[PDB]
């Protein structure tokens, strides 16, 4: 719903104006989007784990948590540590195509994906896809028909 300007201000400048006392980087980078997925990338000094400075930064992010728009943290924010390396791609599709890519996505995602995450040796299973939802499609002729607002 919000733009890259709202990304920059309500999210990103919160971080920049909280990325303070930050330790052991090599640098930091970030980008914006109109879609809403803000991404900050944080290149750090080697020799150490991700986890110490991870919890440093994500706990001054914990200091930054009510400063967020309430709505996105009501959705949730990925504050992750991952090295950006794949392991593999996994090809999951109804060859009939009777099911949507969403249908396969929440099929494996609810069903199968999780016990892969209950198996050894996992980084992230990128769900190219998502959960189902209660998707709803209004009509202004119907709201108008009953003199209503969403």
């Amino acid at each position: 719903g919000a733009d890259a300007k709202t990304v920059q201000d309500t999210v990103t400048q919160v971080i920049e104006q909280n990325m303070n006392g930050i330790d052991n980087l090599m640098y930091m980078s970030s980008n914006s989007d109109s879609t809403g997925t803000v991404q900050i990338t944080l290149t750090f000094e080697s020799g150490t784990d991700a986890d110490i400075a991870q919890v440093q930064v994500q706990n001054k992010l914990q200091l930054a948590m009510p400063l967020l728009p309430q709505e996105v943290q009501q959705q949730g924010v990925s504050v992750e540590k991952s090295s950006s390396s794949f392991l593999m791609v996994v090809g999951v599709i109804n060859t009939d195509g009777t099911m949507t890519q969403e249908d396969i996505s929440d099929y494996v995602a609810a069903n199968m994906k999780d016990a892969i995450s209950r198996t050894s040796g996992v980084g992230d299973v990128q769900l190219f896809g998502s959960q189902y939802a209660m998707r709803i499609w209004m009509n202004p002729n119907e709201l108008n028909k009953f003199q209503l607002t969403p």
Partner: protein, 50 residues
Amino acid sequence: LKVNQDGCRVLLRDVAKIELGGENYDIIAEFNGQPASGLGIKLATGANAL
């Protein structure tokens, strides 16, 4: 949803469409002629490969 004093019930299906939902709908990803679903795997640190 709303009524009048008669109780003329209004239902959410009467005003809108109910279904399952992608949280986005943005990636039409395709592999070998049909659009296909994909599952990335990434690395566990300190694990094996073979």
